[PDB]
PDB file of all heavy atoms in Angstrom:
ATOM      1  N   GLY P   7      59.527  24.820 -15.641  1.00 32.30           N
ATOM      2  CA  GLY P   7      58.328  24.068 -15.882  1.00 32.30           C
ATOM      3  C   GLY P   7      57.854  23.287 -14.690  1.00 32.30           C
ATOM      4  O   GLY P   7      58.554  23.099 -13.737  1.00 32.30           O
ATOM      5  N   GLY P   8      56.608  22.887 -14.765  1.00 30.95           N
ATOM      6  CA  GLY P   8      55.976  22.119 -13.740  1.00 30.95           C
ATOM      7  C   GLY P   8      56.585  20.776 -13.506  1.00 30.95           C
ATOM      8  O   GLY P   8      57.087  20.128 -14.380  1.00 30.95           O
ATOM      9  N   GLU P   9      56.540  20.381 -12.259  1.00 30.68           N
ATOM     10  CA  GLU P   9      57.171  19.190 -11.810  1.00 30.68           C
ATOM     11  C   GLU P   9      56.194  18.237 -11.201  1.00 30.68           C
ATOM     12  O   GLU P   9      55.252  18.626 -10.578  1.00 30.68           O
ATOM     13  CB  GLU P   9      58.184  19.530 -10.733  1.00 30.68           C
ATOM     14  CG  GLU P   9      59.200  20.557 -11.114  1.00 30.68           C
ATOM     15  CD  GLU P   9      60.517  19.958 -11.515  1.00 30.68           C
ATOM     16  OE1 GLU P   9      60.686  18.755 -11.325  1.00 30.68           O
ATOM     17  OE2 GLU P   9      61.372  20.690 -12.014  1.00 30.68           O
ATOM     18  N   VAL P  10      56.468  16.967 -11.374  1.00 30.09           N
ATOM     19  CA  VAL P  10      55.852  15.940 -10.592  1.00 30.09           C
ATOM     20  C   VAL P  10      56.966  15.281  -9.856  1.00 30.09           C
ATOM     21  O   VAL P  10      57.939  14.918 -10.444  1.00 30.09           O
ATOM     22  CB  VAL P  10      55.206  14.898 -11.466  1.00 30.09           C
ATOM     23  CG1 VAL P  10      54.343  13.981 -10.630  1.00 30.09           C
ATOM     24  CG2 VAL P  10      54.437  15.570 -12.567  1.00 30.09           C
ATOM     25  N   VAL P  11      56.813  15.153  -8.557  1.00 27.99           N
ATOM     26  CA  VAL P  11      57.841  14.613  -7.723  1.00 27.99           C
ATOM     27  C   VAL P  11      57.278  13.742  -6.638  1.00 27.99           C
ATOM     28  O   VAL P  11      56.114  13.748  -6.416  1.00 27.99           O
ATOM     29  CB  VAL P  11      58.697  15.692  -7.114  1.00 27.99           C
ATOM     30  CG1 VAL P  11      59.532  16.351  -8.187  1.00 27.99           C
ATOM     31  CG2 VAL P  11      57.844  16.666  -6.364  1.00 27.99           C
ATOM     32  N   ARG P  12      58.123  12.964  -5.998  1.00 27.76           N
ATOM     33  CA  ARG P  12      57.685  12.002  -5.045  1.00 27.76           C
ATOM     34  C   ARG P  12      57.958  12.511  -3.690  1.00 27.76           C
ATOM     35  O   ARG P  12      58.864  13.247  -3.478  1.00 27.76           O
ATOM     36  CB  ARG P  12      58.420  10.691  -5.228  1.00 27.76           C
ATOM     37  CG  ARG P  12      58.470  10.186  -6.642  1.00 27.76           C
ATOM     38  CD  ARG P  12      57.106   9.990  -7.207  1.00 27.76           C
ATOM     39  NE  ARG P  12      57.141   9.806  -8.633  1.00 27.76           N
ATOM     40  CZ  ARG P  12      56.145   9.310  -9.345  1.00 27.76           C
ATOM     41  NH1 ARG P  12      55.034   8.951  -8.760  1.00 27.76           N
ATOM     42  NH2 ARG P  12      56.267   9.184 -10.647  1.00 27.76           N
ATOM     43  N   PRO P  13      57.141  12.098  -2.759  1.00 31.23           N
ATOM     44  CA  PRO P  13      57.244  12.573  -1.392  1.00 31.23           C
ATOM     45  C   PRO P  13      58.547  12.181  -0.755  1.00 31.23           C
ATOM     46  O   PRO P  13      59.000  11.083  -0.947  1.00 31.23           O
ATOM     47  CB  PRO P  13      56.071  11.919  -0.703  1.00 31.23           C
ATOM     48  CG  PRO P  13      55.652  10.845  -1.580  1.00 31.23           C
ATOM     49  CD  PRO P  13      55.997  11.225  -2.958  1.00 31.23           C
ATOM     50  N   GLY P  14      59.137  13.099  -0.007  1.00 30.32           N
ATOM     51  CA  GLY P  14      60.402  12.875   0.644  1.00 30.32           C
ATOM     52  C   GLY P  14      61.588  13.202  -0.205  1.00 30.32           C
ATOM     53  O   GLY P  14      62.690  13.070   0.210  1.00 30.32           O
ATOM     54  N   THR P  15      61.338  13.619  -1.416  1.00 29.77           N
ATOM     55  CA  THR P  15      62.354  14.175  -2.248  1.00 29.77           C
ATOM     56  C   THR P  15      62.413  15.674  -2.131  1.00 29.77           C
ATOM     57  O   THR P  15      61.760  16.258  -1.304  1.00 29.77           O
ATOM     58  CB  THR P  15      62.185  13.790  -3.702  1.00 29.77           C
ATOM     59  OG1 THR P  15      60.947  14.272  -4.162  1.00 29.77           O
ATOM     60  CG2 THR P  15      62.161  12.333  -3.823  1.00 29.77           C
ATOM     61  N   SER P  16      63.239  16.270  -2.979  1.00 28.70           N
ATOM     62  CA  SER P  16      63.506  17.680  -2.983  1.00 28.70           C
ATOM     63  C   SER P  16      63.309  18.175  -4.358  1.00 28.70           C
ATOM     64  O   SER P  16      63.480  17.438  -5.270  1.00 28.70           O
ATOM     65  CB  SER P  16      64.943  17.930  -2.592  1.00 28.70           C
ATOM     66  OG  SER P  16      65.112  17.828  -1.199  1.00 28.70           O
ATOM     67  N   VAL P  17      62.929  19.431  -4.501  1.00 30.14           N
ATOM     68  CA  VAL P  17      62.760  20.048  -5.803  1.00 30.14           C
ATOM     69  C   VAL P  17      63.399  21.416  -5.843  1.00 30.14           C
ATOM     70  O   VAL P  17      63.412  22.113  -4.858  1.00 30.14           O
ATOM     71  CB  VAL P  17      61.279  20.208  -6.131  1.00 30.14           C
ATOM     72  CG1 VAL P  17      61.103  21.092  -7.302  1.00 30.14           C
ATOM     73  CG2 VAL P  17      60.692  18.886  -6.484  1.00 30.14           C
ATOM     74  N   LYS P  18      63.910  21.812  -6.987  1.00 32.34           N
ATOM     75  CA  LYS P  18      64.461  23.140  -7.120  1.00 32.34           C
ATOM     76  C   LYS P  18      63.830  23.869  -8.281  1.00 32.34           C
ATOM     77  O   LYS P  18      63.866  23.386  -9.369  1.00 32.34           O
ATOM     78  CB  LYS P  18      65.967  23.052  -7.300  1.00 32.34           C
ATOM     79  CG  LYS P  18      66.728  24.357  -7.348  1.00 32.34           C
ATOM     80  CD  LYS P  18      68.079  24.215  -6.687  1.00 32.34           C
ATOM     81  CE  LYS P  18      69.192  24.885  -7.468  1.00 32.34           C
ATOM     82  NZ  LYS P  18      70.024  23.942  -8.272  1.00 32.34           N
ATOM     83  N   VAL P  19      63.275  25.041  -8.064  1.00 32.81           N
ATOM     84  CA  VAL P  19      62.596  25.756  -9.140  1.00 32.81           C
ATOM     85  C   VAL P  19      63.300  27.033  -9.498  1.00 32.81           C
ATOM     86  O   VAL P  19      63.800  27.695  -8.652  1.00 32.81           O
ATOM     87  CB  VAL P  19      61.117  26.070  -8.806  1.00 32.81           C
ATOM     88  CG1 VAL P  19      60.234  24.974  -9.300  1.00 32.81           C
ATOM     89  CG2 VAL P  19      60.915  26.237  -7.325  1.00 32.81           C
ATOM     90  N   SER P  20      63.335  27.386 -10.761  1.00 32.73           N
ATOM     91  CA  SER P  20      64.062  28.580 -11.159  1.00 32.73           C
ATOM     92  C   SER P  20      63.247  29.766 -11.664  1.00 32.73           C
ATOM     93  O   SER P  20      62.333  29.581 -12.374  1.00 32.73           O
ATOM     94  CB  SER P  20      65.116  28.196 -12.168  1.00 32.73           C
ATOM     95  OG  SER P  20      64.544  27.806 -13.370  1.00 32.73           O
ATOM     96  N   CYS P  21      63.586  30.972 -11.240  1.00 34.56           N
ATOM     97  CA  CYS P  21      63.048  32.225 -11.773  1.00 34.56           C
ATOM     98  C   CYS P  21      64.174  32.879 -12.575  1.00 34.56           C
ATOM     99  O   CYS P  21      65.156  33.266 -12.028  1.00 34.56           O
ATOM    100  CB  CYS P  21      62.682  33.178 -10.608  1.00 34.56           C
ATOM    101  SG  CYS P  21      61.796  34.766 -10.838  1.00 34.56           S
ATOM    102  N   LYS P  22      64.008  33.073 -13.856  1.00 34.34           N
ATOM    103  CA  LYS P  22      65.027  33.787 -14.591  1.00 34.34           C
ATOM    104  C   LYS P  22      64.622  35.204 -14.982  1.00 34.34           C
ATOM    105  O   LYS P  22      63.695  35.404 -15.708  1.00 34.34           O
ATOM    106  CB  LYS P  22      65.408  33.015 -15.830  1.00 34.34           C
ATOM    107  CG  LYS P  22      66.252  33.811 -16.781  1.00 34.34           C
ATOM    108  CD  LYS P  22      67.083  32.908 -17.664  1.00 34.34           C
ATOM    109  CE  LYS P  22      68.098  33.756 -18.370  1.00 34.34           C
ATOM    110  NZ  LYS P  22      68.275  34.981 -17.553  1.00 34.34           N
ATOM    111  N   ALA P  23      65.385  36.176 -14.535  1.00 31.75           N
ATOM    112  CA  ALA P  23      65.021  37.556 -14.702  1.00 31.75           C
ATOM    113  C   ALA P  23      65.617  38.269 -15.899  1.00 31.75           C
ATOM    114  O   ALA P  23      66.779  38.222 -16.150  1.00 31.75           O
ATOM    115  CB  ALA P  23      65.309  38.316 -13.438  1.00 31.75           C
ATOM    116  N   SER P  24      64.777  38.948 -16.636  1.00 32.64           N
ATOM    117  CA  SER P  24      65.215  39.709 -17.763  1.00 32.64           C
ATOM    118  C   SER P  24      64.555  41.042 -17.820  1.00 32.64           C
ATOM    119  O   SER P  24      63.486  41.242 -17.292  1.00 32.64           O
ATOM    120  CB  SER P  24      64.880  38.988 -19.028  1.00 32.64           C
ATOM    121  OG  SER P  24      63.500  38.891 -19.138  1.00 32.64           O
ATOM    122  N   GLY P  25      65.219  41.970 -18.475  1.00 33.75           N
ATOM    123  CA  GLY P  25      64.662  43.270 -18.721  1.00 33.75           C
ATOM    124  C   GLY P  25      64.814  44.314 -17.659  1.00 33.75           C
ATOM    125  O   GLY P  25      64.200  45.341 -17.750  1.00 33.75           O
ATOM    126  N   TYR P  26      65.613  44.040 -16.656  1.00 31.72           N
ATOM    127  CA  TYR P  26      65.840  44.992 -15.600  1.00 31.72           C
ATOM    128  C   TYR P  26      67.072  44.617 -14.829  1.00 31.72           C
ATOM    129  O   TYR P  26      67.697  43.659 -15.128  1.00 31.72           O
ATOM    130  CB  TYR P  26      64.645  45.082 -14.691  1.00 31.72           C
ATOM    131  CG  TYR P  26      64.508  43.929 -13.768  1.00 31.72           C
ATOM    132  CD1 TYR P  26      64.894  44.032 -12.473  1.00 31.72           C
ATOM    133  CD2 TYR P  26      63.968  42.738 -14.187  1.00 31.72           C
ATOM    134  CE1 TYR P  26      64.763  42.992 -11.625  1.00 31.72           C
ATOM    135  CE2 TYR P  26      63.844  41.681 -13.326  1.00 31.72           C
ATOM    136  CZ  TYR P  26      64.247  41.825 -12.060  1.00 31.72           C
ATOM    137  OH  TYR P  26      64.135  40.821 -11.201  1.00 31.72           O
ATOM    138  N   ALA P  27      67.427  45.398 -13.840  1.00 28.45           N
ATOM    139  CA  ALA P  27      68.618  45.114 -13.081  1.00 28.45           C
ATOM    140  C   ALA P  27      68.376  44.167 -11.947  1.00 28.45           C
ATOM    141  O   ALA P  27      67.898  44.540 -10.914  1.00 28.45           O
ATOM    142  CB  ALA P  27      69.189  46.401 -12.539  1.00 28.45           C
ATOM    143  N   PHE P  28      68.826  42.946 -12.133  1.00 28.51           N
ATOM    144  CA  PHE P  28      68.492  41.829 -11.292  1.00 28.51           C
ATOM    145  C   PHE P  28      68.959  42.085  -9.904  1.00 28.51           C
ATOM    146  O   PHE P  28      68.261  41.784  -8.981  1.00 28.51           O
ATOM    147  CB  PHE P  28      69.171  40.576 -11.828  1.00 28.51           C
ATOM    148  CG  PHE P  28      68.933  39.342 -11.026  1.00 28.51           C
ATOM    149  CD1 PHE P  28      67.676  38.888 -10.785  1.00 28.51           C
ATOM    150  CD2 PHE P  28      69.975  38.621 -10.557  1.00 28.51           C
ATOM    151  CE1 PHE P  28      67.455  37.744 -10.065  1.00 28.51           C
ATOM    152  CE2 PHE P  28      69.775  37.475  -9.843  1.00 28.51           C
ATOM    153  CZ  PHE P  28      68.512  37.030  -9.596  1.00 28.51           C
ATOM    154  N   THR P  29      70.135  42.652  -9.763  1.00 25.81           N
ATOM    155  CA  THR P  29      70.657  42.926  -8.457  1.00 25.81           C
ATOM    156  C   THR P  29      70.049  44.056  -7.691  1.00 25.81           C
ATOM    157  O   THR P  29      70.296  44.153  -6.547  1.00 25.81           O
ATOM    158  CB  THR P  29      72.191  42.983  -8.392  1.00 25.81           C
ATOM    159  OG1 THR P  29      72.686  43.929  -9.317  1.00 25.81           O
ATOM    160  CG2 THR P  29      72.768  41.662  -8.696  1.00 25.81           C
ATOM    161  N   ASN P  30      69.308  44.949  -8.303  1.00 24.79           N
ATOM    162  CA  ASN P  30      68.734  46.021  -7.516  1.00 24.79           C
ATOM    163  C   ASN P  30      67.385  45.717  -6.915  1.00 24.79           C
ATOM    164  O   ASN P  30      66.882  46.466  -6.134  1.00 24.79           O
ATOM    165  CB  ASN P  30      68.603  47.296  -8.323  1.00 24.79           C
ATOM    166  CG  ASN P  30      69.921  47.851  -8.792  1.00 24.79           C
ATOM    167  OD1 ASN P  30      70.972  47.488  -8.330  1.00 24.79           O
ATOM    168  ND2 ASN P  30      69.846  48.743  -9.741  1.00 24.79           N
ATOM    169  N   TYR P  31      66.784  44.621  -7.288  1.00 25.30           N
ATOM    170  CA  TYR P  31      65.470  44.339  -6.794  1.00 25.30           C
ATOM    171  C   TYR P  31      65.399  43.026  -6.089  1.00 25.30           C
ATOM    172  O   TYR P  31      65.932  42.064  -6.525  1.00 25.30           O
ATOM    173  CB  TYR P  31      64.467  44.387  -7.931  1.00 25.30           C
ATOM    174  CG  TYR P  31      64.288  45.744  -8.515  1.00 25.30           C
ATOM    175  CD1 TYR P  31      64.815  46.072  -9.719  1.00 25.30           C
ATOM    176  CD2 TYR P  31      63.598  46.680  -7.859  1.00 25.30           C
ATOM    177  CE1 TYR P  31      64.659  47.316 -10.246  1.00 25.30           C
ATOM    178  CE2 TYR P  31      63.427  47.920  -8.368  1.00 25.30           C
ATOM    179  CZ  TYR P  31      63.961  48.235  -9.549  1.00 25.30           C
ATOM    180  OH  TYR P  31      63.751  49.466 -10.018  1.00 25.30           O
ATOM    181  N   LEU P  32      64.691  43.017  -4.985  1.00 26.49           N
ATOM    182  CA  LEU P  32      64.388  41.830  -4.227  1.00 26.49           C
ATOM    183  C   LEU P  32      63.550  40.884  -5.019  1.00 26.49           C
ATOM    184  O   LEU P  32      62.732  41.282  -5.787  1.00 26.49           O
ATOM    185  CB  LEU P  32      63.590  42.174  -2.995  1.00 26.49           C
ATOM    186  CG  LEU P  32      64.260  42.873  -1.838  1.00 26.49           C
ATOM    187  CD1 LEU P  32      63.414  42.867  -0.593  1.00 26.49           C
ATOM    188  CD2 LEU P  32      65.640  42.322  -1.579  1.00 26.49           C
ATOM    189  N   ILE P  33      63.787  39.613  -4.803  1.00 27.01           N
ATOM    190  CA  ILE P  33      62.992  38.563  -5.374  1.00 27.01           C
ATOM    191  C   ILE P  33      62.237  37.815  -4.295  1.00 27.01           C
ATOM    192  O   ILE P  33      62.821  37.242  -3.427  1.00 27.01           O
ATOM    193  CB  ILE P  33      63.886  37.593  -6.121  1.00 27.01           C
ATOM    194  CG1 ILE P  33      64.507  38.280  -7.309  1.00 27.01           C
ATOM    195  CG2 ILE P  33      63.126  36.344  -6.507  1.00 27.01           C
ATOM    196  CD1 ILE P  33      63.531  38.608  -8.365  1.00 27.01           C
ATOM    197  N   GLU P  34      60.926  37.785  -4.390  1.00 27.27           N
ATOM    198  CA  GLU P  34      60.157  37.136  -3.370  1.00 27.27           C
ATOM    199  C   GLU P  34      59.518  35.892  -3.878  1.00 27.27           C
ATOM    200  O   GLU P  34      59.404  35.711  -5.025  1.00 27.27           O
ATOM    201  CB  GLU P  34      59.130  38.059  -2.762  1.00 27.27           C
ATOM    202  CG  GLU P  34      59.733  39.364  -2.328  1.00 27.27           C
ATOM    203  CD  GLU P  34      59.291  39.847  -0.984  1.00 27.27           C
ATOM    204  OE1 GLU P  34      58.943  39.050  -0.144  1.00 27.27           O
ATOM    205  OE2 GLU P  34      59.321  41.032  -0.755  1.00 27.27           O
TER     206      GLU P  34
END
Side-chain angles (χ1 to χ4, degrees):
Chain P
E9 306 260 351
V10 191
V11 291
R12 312 302 167 163
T15 61
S16 281
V17 168
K18 185 145 137 259
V19 268
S20 69
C21 187
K22 169 156 192 23
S24 64
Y26 75 101
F28 179 57
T29 56
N30 297 345
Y31 293 105
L32 288 193
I33 294 291
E34 309 224 28

